[PDB]
């Protein structure tokens, strides 16, 4: 998880 | 006067194409024409009454495409029209407007972290690169005060930043300014009265709810009242002397709360909720669609 945006990277 | 707070795009599970507008006069929300491509980490701005969506990324189930796109929404027609694309994709971009010209600041392209900056000419429909920032910045907060462009915080690919710099257009030059008291990436940065506000963000450990403002004359950062919710990757804009922050990520859920800062009383209050929680939206204010 991108902790700044909440986006899942894989 | 009939202006709305537009929110474009954002992220929840995937990048979104929503365009919704909030009316502070009556508290109503309107869903308008979708973006042609879903984008999160984009920026919104307004020139000549037209809304612009700049950069971002389509984080989809099948793809992760950074965007160099510039798209223009017309409230009169409720339609999106593409414009000339930027020189490079810019995810988690910062955007400011000086004298009808759109400045695109920083952002990421894959694992590259931009220091580059480029300037859009609406009537000529042209982008041109200008002087790059002193620091590479993604998730950078950008605002304009007294026809000067400020780039606040962000992430340079190694460290989150409390540094900030100012772009002086007549000299095509960037200068560092006083650094913030708090390291901030993904904060909401706007201008209210004679101050640049930095709200929320991520300091490397936790999402922030603190807010500090920069007095360009005294060159100091001062904390004001904190937001009710910790949030990073929030939307932010100013409307009639108040700051509105929209959504973001608090480390647990994607917020739908919209908080409002009154500088006369130095207080935050929740004024509405978005139709759904999301982060990484692009926010701007212009006339209502009709």
Curated annotation (Swiss-Prot), chain A:
Phenotype of the disrupted gene, per the record: Mice are viable and fertile but have low and uninducible phase 2 detoxifying enzymes, are much more susceptible to carcinogens and the toxicity of oxygen and electrophiles and cannot be protected by inducers. Mutant mice show an increased mortality during LPS and cecal ligation and puncture-induced septic shock compared to wild-types. They show greater pulmonary inflammation and greater TNF secretion upon LPS administration. Mice lacking both Nfe2l2/Nrf2 and Keap1 reverse the hyperkeratosis phenotype observed in Keap1 knockout: mice and are healthy and viable in normal conditions.
Record's comment on post-translational modification: Ubiquitinated in the cytoplasm by the BCR(KEAP1) E3 ubiquitin ligase complex leading to its degradation. In response to oxidative stress, electrophile metabolites, such as sulforaphane, modify KEAP1, leading to inhibit activity of the BCR(KEAP1) complex, promoting NFE2L2/NRF2 nuclear accumulation and activity. In response to autophagy, the BCR(KEAP1) complex is inactivated.
Tissue: Widely expressed. Highest expression in liver, skeletal muscle, luminal cells of the stomach and intestine, lining of the bronchi and alveoli, and in renal tubules; followed by heart, spleen, testis and brain.
Motif (ETGE motif): 4-7
Localization, UniProt: Cytoplasm, Cytosol; Nucleus
Domain notes: The ETGE motif, and to a lower extent the DLG motif, mediate interaction with KEAP1.
Family: Belongs to the bZIP family. CNC subfamily.
Subunit record text: Heterodimer; heterodimerizes with small Maf proteins. Interacts (via the bZIP domain) with MAFG and MAFK; required for binding to antioxidant response elements (AREs) on DNA. Interacts with KEAP1; the interaction is direct and promotes ubiquitination by the BCR(KEAP1) E3 ubiquitin ligase complex. Forms a ternary complex with PGAM5 and KEAP1. Interacts with EEF1D at heat shock promoter elements (HSE). Interacts via its leucine-zipper domain with the coiled-coil domain of PMF1. Interacts with CHD6; involved in activation of the transcription.
Function noted in UniProt: Transcription factor that plays a key role in the response to oxidative stress: binds to antioxidant response (ARE) elements present in the promoter region of many cytoprotective genes, such as phase 2 detoxifying enzymes, and promotes their expression, thereby neutralizing reactive electrophiles. In normal conditions, ubiquitinated and degraded in the cytoplasm by the BCR(KEAP1) complex.
Protein name: Nuclear factor erythroid 2-related factor 2
Organism the protein comes from: Mus musculus (Mouse)
Residues of the full protein shown: 76 to 85 of 597
UniProtKB/Swiss-Prot annotation, chain B:
Native organism: Mus musculus (Mouse)
Primary localization: cytoplasm
Family the entry assigns: Belongs to the KEAP1 family.
GO MF term set: disordered domain specific binding; identical protein binding; RNA polymerase II-specific DNA-binding transcription factor binding; transcription regulator inhibitor activity; ubiquitin-like ligase-substrate adaptor activity
S-cGMP-cysteine sites (modified residues): 111
GO BP: any one term: cellular response to oxidative stress
Domain notes per entry: The Kelch repeats mediate interaction with NFE2L2/NRF2, BPTF and PGAM5. KEAP1 contains reactive cysteine residues that act as sensors for endogenously produced and exogenously encountered small molecules, which react with sulfhydryl groups and modify the cysteine sensors, leading to impair ability of the BCR(KEAP1) complex to ubiquitinate target proteins.
Cystine residue pairs: none
Substitution effect: residue 57 to M: Impaired interaction with NFE2L2/NRF2
Null allele phenotype: Early postnatal lethality caused by abnormal cornification. Mice survive until weaning and probably die from malnutrition resulting from hyperkeratosis in the esophagus and forestomach that cause gastric obstruction. Defects are caused by constitutive activation Nfe2l2/Nrf2, leading to constitutive expression of phase 2 detoxifying enzymes. Mice lacking both Nfe2l2/Nrf2 and Keap1 reverse the hyperkeratosis phenotype and are healthy and viable in normal conditions.
S-(2-succinyl)cysteine PTM positions: 290
Keywords: Cytoplasm, Kelch repeat, Nucleus, Repeat, S-nitrosylation, Thioether bond, Ubl conjugation, Ubl conjugation pathway
Oligomer status and interactors: Component of the BCR(KEAP1) E3 ubiquitin ligase complex, at least composed of 2 molecules of CUL3, 2 molecules of KEAP1, and RBX1. Interacts with NFE2L2/NRF2; the interaction is direct. Forms a ternary complex with NFE2L2/NRF2 and PGAM5. Interacts with (phosphorylated) SQSTM1/p62; the interaction is direct and inactivates the BCR(KEAP1) complex by sequestering it in inclusion bodies, promoting its degradation. Interacts with NFE2L1. Interacts with BPTF and PTMA. Interacts with MAP1LC3B. Interacts indirectly with ENC1. Interacts with SESN1 and SESN2. Interacts with HSP90AA1 and HSP90AB1.
Protein name listed in UniProt: Kelch-like ECH-associated protein 1
Record's subcellular location: Cytoplasm; Nucleus
Function: Substrate-specific adapter of a BCR (BTB-CUL3-RBX1) E3 ubiquitin ligase complex that regulates the response to oxidative stress by targeting NFE2L2/NRF2 for ubiquitination. KEAP1 acts as a key sensor of oxidative and electrophilic stress: in normal conditions, the BCR(KEAP1) complex mediates ubiquitination and degradation of NFE2L2/NRF2, a transcription factor regulating expression of many cytoprotective genes.
Extent of the Kelch repeats: 4-49, 50-100, 101-147, 148-194, 196-241, 242-288
Site location (Sensor for electrophilic agents): 111
